[PDB]
Amino acid sequence: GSVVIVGRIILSGSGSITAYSQQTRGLLGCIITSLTGRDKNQVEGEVQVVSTATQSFLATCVNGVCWTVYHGAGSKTLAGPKGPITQMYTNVDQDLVGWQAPPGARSLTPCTCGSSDLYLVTRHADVIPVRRRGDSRGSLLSPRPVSYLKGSSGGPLLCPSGHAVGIFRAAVCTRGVAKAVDFVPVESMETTMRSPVFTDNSSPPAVPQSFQVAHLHAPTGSGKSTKVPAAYAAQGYKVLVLNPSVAATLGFGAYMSKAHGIDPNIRTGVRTITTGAPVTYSTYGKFLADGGCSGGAYDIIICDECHSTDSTTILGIGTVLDQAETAGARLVVLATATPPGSVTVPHPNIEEVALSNTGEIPFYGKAIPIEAIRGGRHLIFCHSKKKCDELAAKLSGLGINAVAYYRGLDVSVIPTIGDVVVVATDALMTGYTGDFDSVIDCNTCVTQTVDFSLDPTFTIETTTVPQDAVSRSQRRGRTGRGRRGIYRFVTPGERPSGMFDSSVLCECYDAGCAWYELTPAETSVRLRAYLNTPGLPVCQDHLEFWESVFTGLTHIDAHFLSQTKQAGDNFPYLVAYQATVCARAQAPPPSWDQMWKCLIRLKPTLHGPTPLLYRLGAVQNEVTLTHPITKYIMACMSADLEVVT
Amino acid sequence: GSVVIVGRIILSGSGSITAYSQQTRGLLGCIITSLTGRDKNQVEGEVQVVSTATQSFLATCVNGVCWTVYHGAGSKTLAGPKGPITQMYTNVDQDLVGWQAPPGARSLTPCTCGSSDLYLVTRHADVIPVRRRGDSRGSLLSPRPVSYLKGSSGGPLLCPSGHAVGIFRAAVCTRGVAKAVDFVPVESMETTMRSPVFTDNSSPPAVPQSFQVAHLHAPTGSGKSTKVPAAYAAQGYKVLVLNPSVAATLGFGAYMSKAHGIDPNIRTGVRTITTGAPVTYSTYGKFLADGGCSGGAYDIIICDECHSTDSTTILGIGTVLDQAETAGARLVVLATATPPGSVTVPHPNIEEVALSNTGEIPFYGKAIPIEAIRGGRHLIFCHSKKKCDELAAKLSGLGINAVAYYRGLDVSVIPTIGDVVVVATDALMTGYTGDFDSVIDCNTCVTQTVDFSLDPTFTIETTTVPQDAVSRSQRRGRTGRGRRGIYRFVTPGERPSGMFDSSVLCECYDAGCAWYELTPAETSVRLRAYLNTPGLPVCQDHLEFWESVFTGLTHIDAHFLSQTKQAGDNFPYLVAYQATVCARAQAPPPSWDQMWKCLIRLKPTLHGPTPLLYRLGAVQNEVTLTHPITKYIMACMSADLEVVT
Ligand SMILES: [Zn+2]
Ligand SMILES: [Zn+2]
């Protein structure tokens, strides 16, 4: 699906800067064009109004290039006269993307006066004034609800001479009111246009004379976590390789032994082996538990799957980036086969076949012919545990050897040999190594996002959404390795990779607080190192906010914590902490669902209005906003929060 | 566009009731089938997933008819194999519409067992247990967040035998958590199927022996407001004719005398004339101001333009309905050219032409060629008053003699039939009566909707939305009146007529309190008569909730209330009440918007956070939630509130 031009914002440089919009495409025209990538319409003007079938935003032409934000456009092609125009430039680090301007493009020219008085052209052809306060920041002379600014990202920031100063990126809010705007300065575009680009870093960086962070992008199975570290060790260095799967980490032992005659150290929360070898294999979690970097222990640290966006991986990489040099490493390598900006492409030996409506097994609105999974080894990804159990039972009743697997079940349930259909969630990646004759992908995932609702503080939501490129490549990747494979899907879509939500940041502080004895202040130092490093997944910078919130959650109750940790829930700390507040006031929990079992015992002694701390789910009980901690987090909501538009 | 079937939910034929979905159509296929109304796919099953170009919901075939909610389907045709299928049934009061089922459709049949154990089927093919609690109400064994039920409107409530009990239409929530569901009972549908498809309401009713409420649906210029009251008078009865506009009200009395014989009584805030005639023309507002129905004063009360959902008309009509019988009337005629569920159709006198991108004056993403408006008289409808101030300016600049019109200005329009272009807001209808050579409609308007956002209480948002049919008809009706006319539009669409938001009820309590010295309880009785009476615009029954919040708003500052009433703004009472708590705490208003101008002169003395009661717009100052009124209004948020799904 390409992005398509659906209109434009026409500006005037005569007299004062004024604008007006002119819609040119309809919804049916927008969808057909989006699907074909073939747009015959003639672009005109510098500011284009664009849409993606899901979202709509602005696109502004400057120096031959039509630019817009990565968060809105992803890595999509632009609909063009002769077909889809693939992107000329892509800078996820700058939230910046470009395409070669179409014949009818006028473009803008970069400002050269250095005027701090700016005008932002919004999608409703509104021109609102802004005073530059930074190289990439400006304050609105008149605060406005964010809502007003949404849908205008990608729009220009102009100087009085009507020249381009930058493109609108994000809004800086205070209790939801936009006070300043965030933009990609035109200079970041020059640099971006000059950036060296076919950039091949598919080879093991040479360890430098002085500390350096290097990237290593190589296809899956190119030996980034085995062949590479082995070669490094032959040269005399001590190597630490970090991975997010407990299963994979354990697996490197036998494999390394046989393929490289190296008997590595293995470190996981379930098992560690210290051989004394010069190569160590560890999970980010276990690395975080060991206390992070040990001085003088390693010359090279290879962060495998550095595109992974779970909190443990980000905190873990953040730790490596913050302390690796001071502990004596010369080289930190960030390796992945799918860096930020990746799109899934055809696999030579994997046949991709769309699932139709015929077949005896219903699957997300489509069907699975039983002939495709009777006999053989097949893997079926579902977005939830409920689904996994439902499907595994449907199949079992049909006589097909089916088994479900997800967080909590022992991998023991998956048989390693013989016919089976495995019904699983993404938990499968850390729990199981193994390939399949085929994989069927529902193409959806469950994700969490923070909503700064002010009812009374914030909310962490759980919704099921369209998988992104790395998800689809990891799922499809369980077939096709050294064997011919089949990948069947519900939908062909794929959302842009390389981005993650602020709730993942919140999870880092929770993990730092519940497992790693990390104070909110040390967690920030590490997350900051992560955010300051280019080439890694990106997210809004809400470190201060998140740190301020957890900083106030003092004297949790060990017993509750213990139980929320044992349970293996998503935010053991925040849950355990709400629970403790409830207890120090005989107040019942926000509700009585699974999430609050750690209080269950006392159900009969608990009543009154639960003093709500934040919203972690349905609040069936009445609530009170008077508790001191609740007021504190309430005050934490007045912080400056940058949110995308 | 028609409604198209894009999937279906398949139910089990035995055992416990279970379900699965089948997705039969994708996005582009749906937008195409919607535009052509031609859907050749073959239908299967009873529960269909259906969709418009903006929403998706469910539809259920019971006894050969495919039913769904009016709040989803409006009066839309159903895409079928021979072309669009028109609605066979349209009950805006029960929120039920029905189309004769297309070939391929199977049907559910009424439940004969009378079980109280029910089952609701959702669009995600989930089967939720419900305990029956009334003929149209049920309790969820497990309360769930409202979001879970959304998109399930039109779905069936099934009995253990899988037979139909009702069709789901709304959830009853408590602070956003659904604890029960509302549904149309199957016996109403059966009644609907035993009754007439066509009903005559085209002619003025004869006066009955005893009090009767009747509907009059006749075209504009049918004498609804002139000829029919004249005839009743001409035959001995005392008739009161109520209208929403003072300009239309004054116009009639002036016309009846010089066209039908005698000088009526005229009652408006601006002009009152007692003549002693048996025909009185009043405004709903003056009628309200006078206290309502005076005993034995009229035999007939005609509520003209009863389709009107502004607050003064609803309060006006609910007052007549609650008092006419005891005041001795024998008849109440609810008259309108566009009743609930109506749809804009061709007018023989009006040529309708869709605007394009070619033209000189930019207009809502489109343009208007000055040639269309160079000579003659024309009316352009704009969503805001600012856009009028804009156009009338650019228009004049092009040398065109234009004049912007909206609330606050006096009829400064040139009726002198002297060449002109009046750029107007909807206020036109209440202030001016003339017709024009042509009418240009932006096709959008500005509405208010309430959000039970709990931050800390509720929010009333102002947003611009596509016009509905009443609006189209009325805006278009300002041309072609007994002479050729031209109707130019930016868009073809049309949202369904007959429904209004809960924030309008809030406006009624506001007005009851600010203008008519009505206690909230008294307002409730009148609104209840309105709600209970059929054939009128519908709304969710949030009567008890609204009554309770206004019941707590006591000891308002007489002076602030007085300035807001005069200023003409929308919630005089809520605005003056919020200003009252602020001023007494020596705190600033939520923002320094115009809405809060009655505090502007107190600005030097106002300091601190504002004790926020509710949200009427952007809150830029810090806020405290300690004030007793805020706490009281917060407690009111725990009422059972029914919201559509
Ligand atoms: Zn400049
Ligand atoms: Zn039954």
Overview of the molecule:
The PDB classes it as hydrolase. The structure is a homodimer of 645-residue chains. With 645 residues, chain A is α/β, with parallel strands linked by helices. In chain A, 25% of the residues lie in helices and 27% in strands. Chain A contains 18 helices and 33 strands. Chain A has a seven-stranded antiparallel sheet with strand order 2-1-3-4-5-7-6. Chain A has a seven-stranded mixed sheet with strand order 14-20-19-15-18-16-17, sandwiched between helices. In chain A, helix 12 packs across helix 13 and helix 12 packs parallel to helix 14 (543-551). The radius of gyration of chain A is 26 Å and the shape is globular. The interface between A and B is medium-sized, with 34 and 34 residues.
SSE map:
The structure is a homodimer of 645-residue chains.
Chain A: E1 4-12, E2 18-23, H1 27-36, E3 47-51, E4 56-62, E5 65-68, H2 70-73, E6 89-91, E7 96-100, E8 117-121, E9 127-132, E10 137-145, H3 146-149, E11 156-158, E12 164-174, E13 177-185, H4 186-194, E14 212-217, H5 227-234, E15 239-243, H6 246-260, E16 265-267, E17 272-273, E18 279-283, H7 284-289, E19 300-303, H8 311-323, E20 331-336, E21 350-354, E22 361-363, E23 366-368, E24 377-381, H9 385-397, E25 402-405, E26 420-424, H10 428-431, E27 438-441, E28 444-451, E29 459-466, H11 469-476, E30 485-489, H12 502-514, H13 520-532, H14 543-551, H15 558-567, H16 572-583, H17 597-600, E31 610-611, E32 623-624, H18 628-636, E33 641-644
Parallel strand pairs in A: 14-20, 15-18, 15-19, 16-18, 19-20, 21-30, 24-26, 24-27, 25-26, 27-30, 31-32
Antiparallel strand pairs in A: 1-2, 1-3, 3-4, 4-5, 5-7, 6-7, 8-9, 8-11, 9-10, 10-13, 11-12, 12-13, 12-33, 16-17, 22-23, 28-29
Bound molecules: zinc ion (2 copies).
PDB class: hydrolase
Keywords: hepatitis C Virus, bifunctional, protease-helicase, hydrolase
Assembly: dimeric
